[PDB]
Structure 1
Amino acid sequence: HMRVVVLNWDLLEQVLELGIQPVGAPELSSYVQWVVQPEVPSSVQDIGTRTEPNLEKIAALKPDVILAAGPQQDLLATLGRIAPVVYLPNFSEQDNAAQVAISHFKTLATLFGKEAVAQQKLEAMYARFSELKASLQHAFGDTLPAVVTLRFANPTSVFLYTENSTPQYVLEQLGLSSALPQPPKEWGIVQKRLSELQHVEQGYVLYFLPFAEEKKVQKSVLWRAMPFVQAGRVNSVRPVWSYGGAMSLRYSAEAITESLLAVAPQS
């Protein structure tokens, strides 16, 4: 067990799930609102933001390894001057986010000697996927409805999750199909006008919390006139980080299932 400084939320999730408490992590108070789980221990110090971390505080913590991701790639050489850096990037244009998250989860387990716990959590995850899938095809029957997932950029713009995203993986693993399929992008997202969601005659629309202007959207004319809105096939999803690690796939699956089991028809 070494002294680990983590520089991204996905990596922060990974080490925590492995039972590795980092001495340094970014934006912890914001982590509470956007990622929620796994819970960051109070012992962990905040070392700044993911894009602009406090190098002096990182050095003062005297880590043994520094874990960096895509957004930190321009600081890799400098971070290396402080401590050895393990660079595990994800959510690139050509990355399949969920598979890469799973692969990184394993490699980190190998590095920190937590392979057994990693296997146990992945096994439980794949089993959990099947349970949730069954819960859906019991409330929806077969076949399962088409689902589109997104976050709000603003009350008139939307981030649709694409083919290489982690919610897409969750949907496929849940037996769900895509209502509005999208080509692979960076971070697994493409930005759309809100009016584009009119093309979702088919089934359900799920949007991830938090969103500060949720109430404003719900009252807007463009939203109240949506096919999925008038049909009641729309719901909010409790905060699950759509740019996280291996276990974020499990959390997403449960939260999505939960929101989708609600607003489901009377069987």
Structure 2
Amino acid sequence: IDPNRIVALEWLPVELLLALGIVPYGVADTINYRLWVSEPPLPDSVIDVGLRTEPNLELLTEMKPSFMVWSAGYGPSPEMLARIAPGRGFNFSDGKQPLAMARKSLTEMADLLNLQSAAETHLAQYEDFIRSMKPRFVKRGARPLLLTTLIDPRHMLVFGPNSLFQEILDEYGIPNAWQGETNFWGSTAVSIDRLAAYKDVDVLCFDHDNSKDMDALMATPLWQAMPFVRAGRFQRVPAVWFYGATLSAMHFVRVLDNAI
């Protein structure tokens, strides 16, 4: 109800709020939100309420949030959270199309806050931006694309058909190189060797203040032996949140455009 006393316990609803012009009263893990999501800027005034997986329950109670928002099936139990203050959990996807859900979640949030018009204006901006950038990729053919991020020297996260990015790749005619298994959120962790299978594809790897790991990884003979690496198709790019919504999707497009 009070638009200035909303606490977002997970980054997905943080993005939904910012899209509607709401300044979050409190946000979980602002530090990492700044380096994993980055693009949508969070003012310094925002109170940090702890890790998304272990929010400072004491601080939350002291704060007396007007409403709390979080991600479905992630973090603290909703039954327990509901004991602190009114709230709503948002879905990232239906297991297949995250962006379709993003548009629904944004509408949902806007209805709760009576910012229906603001939602419509943002959604128009979103669809127009996506469509306007389509010609920037008419040059490339059917060469598939592999989207990844380094978890640790021994494991790479890869994003599949049900990831946030797929809908955009489909609109731009870019095949997704990963057609293997994925988790609900569209990703899966694989050993570095599993990446050697991809002989001629473009590979983007989202940085997240992990130059030390990328160095160790890129120093192994295996990495140097990677066909797409030797072919000069590997590229490190700025961080883009892969479990976000429309803002993350637009940020992806900007990063995508700059890369290919």
**TM-score, with normalisation over the residues of structure 2?**
0.91
Shift of 1:144: 4.2
1:185 to 183, 186, 192: 183
Cα separation, 2, equivalents of 1:196 and 1:17: 37
Shift of 1:217: 2.0
Shift of 1:234: 1.3
Cα separation, 2, equivalents of 1:170 and 1:223: 28
The range that moved more, 116-125 or 1-10, is: 116-125
The range that moved more, 182-191 or 206-215, is: 182-191
Please, which runs of 5 or more residues in structure 1 have no aligned partner?
Answer: 261-267
Shift of 1:257: 2.1
Q: Tell me the equivalent position of 2:125.
A: 124
Cα separation, 2, equivalents of 1:90 and 1:237: 24
CA contact (8 A) 1:91 1:243 kept: no
2:144 to 143, 146, 162: 146
Deviations along 1:86-130, one digit per CA (max 9) or x if unpaired, are 1113257x3532222221111101111222222222222222222
Q: Tell me the equivalent position of 1:28.
A: 30
Amino acid at match of 2:138: Q
Deviations along 1:56-106, one digit per CA (max 9) or x if unpaired, are 2112222211112135464212221221111113257x3532222221111
Q: Tell me the equivalent position of 1:263.
A: none
Q: Tell me the equivalent position of 1:248.
A: 248
CA contact (8 A) 2:107 2:116 kept: yes
Q: Tell me the equivalent position of 1:62.
A: 64
Is the aligned partner of 1:220 residue 2:226?
no
Shift of 1:44: 1.3
Please, which runs of 5 or more residues in structure 2 have no aligned partner?
Answer: none
The number of aligned residues is: 256
Shift of 1:145: 2.4
2:55 aligned counterpart, secondary structure: coil
Is the aligned partner of 1:103 residue 2:101?
no
Is the aligned partner of 1:4 residue 2:6?
yes
Amino acid at match of 1:172: D
Identity %: 27
CA contact (8 A) 2:54 2:76 kept: no
Amino acid at match of 1:198: A
Cα separation, 2, equivalents of 1:123 and 1:101: 14
Q: What is the RMSD computed on CA atoms of the aligned residues?
A: 1.9
Q: Tell me the equivalent position of 1:49.
A: 51
Task: Describe the shift of the 1:174–1:165 C-alpha distance in structure 2 as closer, same or farther (beyond 3 A).
Answer: same
1:151 aligned counterpart, secondary structure: strand
**TM-score, with normalisation over the residues of structure 1?**
0.89
Shift of 1:214: 1.3
2:157 to 156, 159, 173: 159
Shift of 1:194: 1.0
Runs of 4+ in 1 over 6 A off after TM superposition: none
Shift of 1:189: 0.9
1:149 aligned counterpart, secondary structure: strand
Amino acid at match of 1:107: E
